[PDB]
Design a protein around this ligand. Structure first.
Ligand SMILES: O=C(NC[C@H]1CCCO1)C1CCCCC1
Length: 330
């Protein structure tokens, strides 16, 4: 089998991407944030505290003839931005772009933190990291991809995120028309539960490529590119007036600037992030200070190749017995 679904920016800055997902019978379509940095499929629901729901579409398990309570199961997750959610668990039929899994764990939120409430466009998350990170207790549950894998034509999914435009998540096949040149595959460590890999270096604009190993994760659920402070300083040093602002919480730059590109290495290959992709706009409405799309990972404990990096590439998440990651230009 295969599946294919379009993923769409939630706003004009590409802060996140949402993909429609069918849950239950009859189908209830929710717009979920596909997140290769976590492993829970959770949704706003009829059980979510009313004051914490503000415009989201909710899953109502009592209206699904295929929903079953997963008795005694609970979940609770907190993300690196300090947001969180928790609740109980149903199994139900879940379909993405034509690909169906029966008995998928659907984690129903009883509580969500303010950031989730405040984002009316995201109805939940669909985790695509390794199932070892799933938070359901006392019986850990599998991701949608892990459940689908064996049935897929090839045990893979691909992320083709757009810049200020829609893109595509495919399951079970590699669309050879979606990228230029070849796909370079690189080794993955699953030891921390992530799609963790080692970039071979970087360049700033037209500058000399620096060979240096950068361990990090491919994370579709993180907006920005988080890299070591040395690398990030080298980038922003090329932008007149750019500086790290403790009050704002990262590098800012004059909105009048034209940003240089940023290149990262994948083996002997190179992915080029255009400068425009690194502009996240005014720090507050009407400001002439703009927020940078490349930020230090110093506070995070891991480097993160988030959407800023991934949307410059066609990315293969290869879930073969020995997982790997592939990157192609596009
Ligand atoms: O919290 C993180 N990113 C943002 C969250 C917000 C909701 C989806 O992702 C990352 C932090 C590094 C480890 C993997 C998760």
């Amino acid at each position: 089998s295969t599946g294919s679904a379009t993923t769409t920016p939630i706003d004009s800055l590409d802060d996140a991407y949402i993909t429609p997902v069918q849950i239950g019978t009859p189908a209830q379509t929710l717009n979920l944030d596909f997140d290769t940095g976590s492993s829970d499929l959770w949704v706003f629901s009829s059980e979510t505290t009313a004051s914490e729901v503000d415009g989201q579409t909710i899953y109502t398990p009592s209206k699904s003839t295929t929903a079953k309570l997963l008795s005694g199961a609970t979940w609770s997750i907190s993300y690196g931005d300090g947001s969180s959610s928790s609740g109980d668990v149903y199994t139900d039929t879940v379909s993405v772009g034509g690909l169906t899994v029966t008995g998928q764990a659907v984690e129903s939120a009883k509580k969500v933190s303010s950031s989730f409430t405040e984002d009316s466009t995201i109805d939940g998350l669909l985790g695509l990291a390794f199932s070892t990170l799933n938070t359901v207790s006392p019986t850990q549950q599998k991701t949608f991809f892990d459940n689908a894998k064996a049935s897929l034509d090839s045990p893979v999914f691909t992320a083709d995120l757009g810049y200020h435009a829609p893109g595509t998540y495919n399951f079970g096949f590699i669309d050879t028309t979606a990228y230029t040149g070849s796909i370079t595959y690189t080794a993955v460590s699953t030891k921390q539960g992530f799609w963790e890999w080692t970039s071979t270096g970087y360049a700033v604009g037209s500058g000399t490529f620096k060979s240096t190993s950068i361990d990090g994760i491919a994370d579709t659920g993180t907006t920005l590119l988080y890299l070591p402070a040395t690398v990030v300083s080298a980038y922003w040093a090329q932008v007149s007036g750019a500086k790290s602002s403790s009050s704002v919480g990262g590098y800012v730059f004059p909105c009048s600037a034209t940003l240089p590109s940023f290149t990262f290495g994948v083996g002997s290959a190179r992915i080029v992030i255009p400068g425009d992709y690194i502009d996240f706009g005014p720090i507050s409405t009407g400001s002439s200070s703009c927020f940078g799309g490349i930020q230090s990972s110093a506070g995070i404990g891991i480097n993160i190749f988030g959407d800023v990096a991934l949307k410059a590439a066609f990315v293969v998440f290869n879930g073969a017995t020995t997982p790997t990651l592939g990157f192609a230009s596009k």
